[PDB]
Design a protein around this nucleic acid. Structure first.
Ligand code: ADP
Ligand code: ADP
Ligand code: ADP
Ligand code: ADP
Ligand code: ADP
Ligand code: ADP
Ligand code: MG
Ligand code: MG
Ligand code: MG
Ligand code: MG
Ligand code: MG
Ligand code: MG
Lengths: 309, 309, 309, 309, 309, 309
DNA sequence: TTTTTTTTTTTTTTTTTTTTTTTT
């Protein structure tokens, strides 16, 4: 899947160097190849003529150049898509949630944004025959709305055993906007010792709202948010996983998502949710590079997301 | 239950720094662990080294990482819930009011919100075998509708001595929004010395209506409200108590609650009350993370909330 | 009772400060302790660095904090209730009109609201041992229906002195909404020197019906009204006076009061009137914080309000 | 259309010198004629008395003097334009995007910058008689939004062979700003072996935002960008290709492009995009040395960009 | 209107000395008169005892002595001035752009600098009775924005055959800073054979930005720029022509031109441009020897610079 | 006012020797007495037995030795001072511009130094009882910003005739440093035939910057400048006139004058000019042996330098 | 032993309110 970080111990590079890189946050050779010279120079003990050797060796083990469009097409026709549990939603997105990008979901209260995440936390483990990825799940929660009792029911629906289903999921809660960025290094270190398929952030902007209050703090807030989004995208490129994030709305003094232009330009796919009749809900594609604009209906039942009955 | 704050006095940290932190508002190690470095820096007399040492010690004391979902399920199985006094209501709520989150009640005039809060303030003290919480209650009133004469009868119903029931409630009245926000620090200071189990805030939005007037003052109003809500949630995290708040309605020019999206997105459970025939009221679940939509019927009597006769 | 506003002159405060305060409208320490700082920073001369000085003062004069509910019971067990002239009404009200809160009376034309106001304006002077308030009365008229011969006849019924009686009632007439609101400052000034015991507003929504017209101004109307209502409560908080307000009805399209949700939520007690046979009338309790629903009968005579014969 | 660098060895210059130059990053005689002397005296192995000879020889093969405006008028009269697929835009721009200069596109999210880049990557491969280039495309992606399925659809629209269309586009992904600058050397190497007609940078400012953060790094940012822009111009001088670059927007704390005065003075043409009704968009000319302000409308379909019905 | 250099060869000076002097870069007697001795003793083949002869010989042909201010006043009255195409501007300038001086035009992007330079390039050939100059223009472009079609549009406005108006302009493009300085020698050689009456340099600081980079090259950059300005002033003195340059701006971290004190002190007149409403622009007087501050308004049309409707 | 040279023709000294002295640049007995024996040798015609006799002569007619303080005080009390024209300026300088010294004005562009020079040039011709000298003007120009029209306009405000105001001014233009120093011999010779009260050099360092460019040529530029300043001082002492000189500024990598330490020590009075609001300017004394350091405000108007209205 | 020079560069959204009025 990836190139380990111990393949760089050659031409004078020792074990202390690799240990220092590990302590900094780099855990594979891809991370080394993706960083610029100044970032390495900021690492204690890494002087010049070590940085040039590290970069040249990493670029030797990893390619960064030109390839035809046909090669990229061939490599893209093998990416895995996750299944949502509903056929209308699968048809709308062309198969499901894809790996290697970022999907964003926004709407008002009780429109079903976290039930879908709960369903994907179980659908990412089943065999690839029925639309899974045979992996684990990482969950980051900033609101306090995570419940395993729904996972047990969804597992029962999909044919898995409860103990294994709950044993293949890792959970963490965030308390401010620095802890949120700190958890990503731990995630990257955990992902290189086993196999993962999905990452969830629920939600992104909830803690940024109160930590930077009013005009006079807007610039710092937007810079911090941009850093977080770049780190998430780098994780997705490193490990080949799927990333899902949630967002809130505000009124135009008829409603729009929060986060400014950084958020709008950073996401790859954007979906909007609306309330319907009874237990039904409506979904619409707002932004995407390869799908047209359309809408569909889904429903919430005791065992997860499904089609209208 | 929580880690005292005097355990952060190692590696040459003087009691003057601890006293300054307490005067700022923090009274547990968890509280220091939950705050970003900017907040500590704003305090006079705290430098970079002091802040770094404080953060490291707190993080070592309190766990902040990744666990498994089975472990979290096993922990959540031990959370207790409080009985409301009505069997249909308890069945509708999955057992009663749950600790660790926030519940909001809304309706029009004379629909039963204040009486339910009174009955909860009495029931949160009875032995845990029958459904109590064995603690004290903290009541914050902003309209002037608190009446101990009701608590006397409700306590008589469950078999308590009126003086014990009356002495174990701490009451406070507010006169504008700033006093409202200020009282929370005194609440937190009081909490860390005794065993509390419930906080009540009656009409969080009554004072905000007239302190800010018309368009041109909306943003400041919403920002102040957001800070208030975040402080409430942090208290719930720190001490593992239950929090109840009430709200008012307005007409659509058929009735909806006031407060906007800031209030809609930050509550965990939402209940709507309606007037019925005689002394009977109707209750509906409008929002929840693990319950479906359902309705029930309860009644108001001289001794509190109960089942229809 | 109310502490004078001249006690805010201990450190760094002169007589000019109190002068501009009394020009603004404040007439007691409580009036300054219950006010927000933004309001303080709006009087020419008080710019900044002095509002905090006043706020810190009066904080040790006016008590503000958390107390036990048993002490609140002890405090509230010493309030004053003024008789209504009818025994059935006194029994239905649990003692009589209560000071510190707001009581509303509504009904259709010639049902007996204004006669009750006239009776109260005299009963609020007799000694406490017979149900009287032994103070003065303030009366505000908005329809041109104040008739002083009724006062003489009623006062004779209760064994008073007509010359003594007629000089103990303050009478005002208003011509528009702004004039109505402005009379409240003179009311506070008059209450600042001589004791009073009751405020009567008859009626409260008469001029609002005309000064604001069409759907294009409702938003402003309900805002203006809101401020008025808040101001009334503040007086009851300072000097401990009983407020009595009157209101009209409209047809549903069988009758309901006017004012909307602002009025419905802002009142503490609500009573409804209907016409009986001959001079008799029927009264009903439509809302209350501590009383059940019940009905009663009274009657109108040459000398006020009494029991049916 | 360019003089090969191998002609630089005539008398006194050996193949080793040309090899050293090629390793430096010069691939044509023009690249030597346009370079200052202190740039030439910076490649190890090159000594004085040889840079002078190189410049003297290059000046002989590449003309650098004075001419009359009639000659310039004729030469610019014989120049090529690339069709955008929309007749409205072609009429607005006077033919279309022209080879030799820099055209910039700016707007907010989902306004259609990337769809026009995808359309141009196909129209740059069709014959000259129908507004084509008869070249190849270079695509540099800093966002990760390149999708070859759109290429196949558009190619079928314009009557190409999808296999060949996929073999005639070169694609690269950049991970930081130094990598972005370094890819231009490989671009220069590639264009000197086979004919190209179009370069796309999508987008130009995305990685600069996070690589340099804050006030203290603004100058070094704007200097780096300057170099990049200058390099782009040189390519258009050397091989005669069209350049298209993409840009984002920000809010005036009503929206403006990012990049500053360097960006504003370095671009020869600027276009602004806005969101219309359905699948329709509005285009406005914001800068040009020969064209007036105006506006038009276009649409996004399954096969690319086109005219609205 | 100048003394040809062939007059300097009288007795003891041969033709080869004149040929060497011309190869050095001097083409007029005034040129030798204004040059110091030290740089005369820098051309190979020029030995002492001849520089003294040249300095003595030329002083008798070019009057360099003390004169009365009345004679100078008379001389400064038969001075040419060229119309800018707008009546508002000519009044603010006192007649046009004066020959023998240096005028600078600065402003942000698309403010009309290059358009005014394109209009001036035509009026410098129309007869004297209407503000013309009856000569030729020398145009130096360092950005790529010179368009011979605007000249075609503007020429017919003033009544010219566009072929003549096109053949009477000399155009040259520069690529680095040293080329820019090298072109001035050819310009000076051209001016000594036919009648020219203007010189445009657009822009003057574009290539200096990137040829020197950082704080470590500022001194050399600023010393290189001084020689350019001195040579321009020498050409203005020698042949009596107007000299017009253009400049860019930066942000003060509201905008200022670039170039420093060297540029600020060397120009005779300075004018700033700004963007108006529609096709309307504003012009200001920022520095002059004998003019007061004042502002006007002009407009850009398809036929050049004019008054606002 | 001084001893004519022709008075030194005595036993042994003939007309030819005095003619040789006149040709060498000595046009006064003081000039002969001001030079050291060494200097009176480069002339062609005197070797020895003549220089000693000349030194013995030219010293009995000119005192060179000790005096008292009171005698010098009495002789210096009869020193005429020119008037600036602005009362604030006249007060600031203790009476106006003095004679027998050197004044240096420096500042950034368009700060008003040249206008002040023009005003002094016309004011030196007014009758003495209002602050004049009753003499002519000597103007030496290096930048090329001399305008007679300002003199024509400034002659009116003082009652002088225009034609006679412009008939008493000699003008010269300098083209390099050699010529700049050469002009002084002619200046002194002409002044030895009339009455003069003003010499102006404007500006003094413009031509030195590019004549001695770059390190390695330093330390010769400074010698040339020192010789020029010494010659100026000798002129001023010989004829008892006033001298004015202007200067430029550079930035410190907030601005300082150019020239070095030779300039700083050689000048007698130094003044710094700053830009103000509208047409106001600020002045500050920087160096003076018998003056305090203060700041003053003046203004520029169509008639000259005046008080701020 | 001597003898100072010379400016540069933009960034970045927020946040709802408030009922009226009888007819044969
Ligand atoms: N056990 C359950 N059975 C059926 N429906 C449920 C169950 N639990 C929650 N729901 C539904 O899911 C909704 C909650 O949506 P959620 O996705 O949590 O909102 P948000 O969009 O704010 O994240 C509730 O309105 C409820 O109707
Ligand atoms: N002792 C009592 N017995 C029966 N009903 C009561 C008693 N006290 C109050 N009530 C009823 O409770 C209602 C008031 O409910 P409350 O909680 O005050 O409404 P809200 O808080 O929503 O304004 C009234 O309609 C009243 O009839
Ligand atoms: N002096 C009186 N003697 C007997 N009955 C009276 C007298 N004055 C008024 N009433 C009766 O009492 C009623 C009082 O109406 P009022 O209270 O003014 O109506 P509202 O409450 O709408 O203002 C009248 O309808 C009238 O029938
Ligand atoms: N196959 C398709 N058919 C129709 N519309 C599409 C298709 N693919 C993408 N779109 C639409 O094109 C829009 C433009 O996206 P894009 O031009 O990539 O945005 P940007 O201008 O930010 O680069 C998207 O909002 C999407 O709805
Ligand atoms: N033919 C034309 N008709 C009208 N306006 C034009 C024409 N050509 C260019 N312009 C306008 O001239 C303006 C300034 O262009 P230019 O003078 O080249 O700017 P600058 O001088 O700042 O480089 C542009 O805003 C453009 O819209
Ligand atoms: N006739 C006039 N009326 C008013 N102000 C003038 C006139 N002529 C020139 N000025 C002002 O004088 C200033 C030029 O000052 P100048 O002597 O050139 O300064 P410096 O020589 O220090 O550069 C300009 O700002 C200009 O506005
Ligand atoms: Mg939600
Ligand atoms: Mg209520
Ligand atoms: Mg009435
Ligand atoms: Mg985009
Ligand atoms: Mg421009
Ligand atoms: Mg100047």
């Amino acid at each position: 899947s990836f190139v380990p970080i111990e393949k760089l111990q050659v031409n004078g590079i020792t074990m202390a160097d690799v240990k220092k890189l590990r302590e900094s946050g780099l855990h594979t050779a891809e991370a080394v190849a993706y960083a610029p010279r100044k970032d390495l120079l900021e690492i204690k003990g890494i002087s010049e003529a070590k940085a040039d050797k590290l970069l040249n060796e990493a670029a030797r083990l990893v390619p960064m150049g030109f390839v035809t469009a046909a090669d990229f097409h061939m490599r893209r026709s093998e990416l895995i898509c996750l299944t949502t549990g509903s056929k209308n939603l699968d048809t709308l997105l062309g198969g499901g949630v894809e790996t290697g990008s970022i999907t964003e979901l926004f709407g008002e209260f009780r429109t079903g944004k976290s039930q879908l995440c709960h369903t994907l936390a179980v659908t990412c483990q089943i065999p690839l025959d029925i639309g899974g990825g045979e992996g684990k799940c990482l969950y980051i929660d900033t609101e306090g709305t995570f419940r395993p009792v729904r996972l047990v029911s969804i597992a029962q629906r999909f044919g898995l055993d409860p103990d294994d289903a709950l044993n293949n999921v890792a959970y963490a809660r965030a308390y401010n906007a620095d802890h949120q960025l700190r958890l990503l290094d731990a995630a990257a270190q955990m992902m290189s010792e086993s196999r993962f398929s999905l990452i969830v952030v629920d939600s992104v902007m909830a803690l940024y709202r109160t930590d930077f209050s009013g005009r006079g703090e807007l610039s710092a807030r937007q810079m911090h948010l941009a850093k977080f989004m770049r780190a998430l995208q780098r994780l997705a490129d490193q490990f080949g996983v799927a990333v899902v994030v949630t967002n809130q709305v505000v009124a135009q003094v008829p409603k729009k998502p929060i986060g400014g232009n950084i958020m709008a330009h950073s996401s790859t796919t954007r979906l909007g949710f609306k309330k319907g009749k009874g237990c039904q809900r409506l979904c619409k594609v707002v932004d995407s590079p390869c799908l047209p604009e359309a809408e569909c209906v889904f429903a919430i039942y005791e065992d997860g997301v499904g089609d209208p009955r």
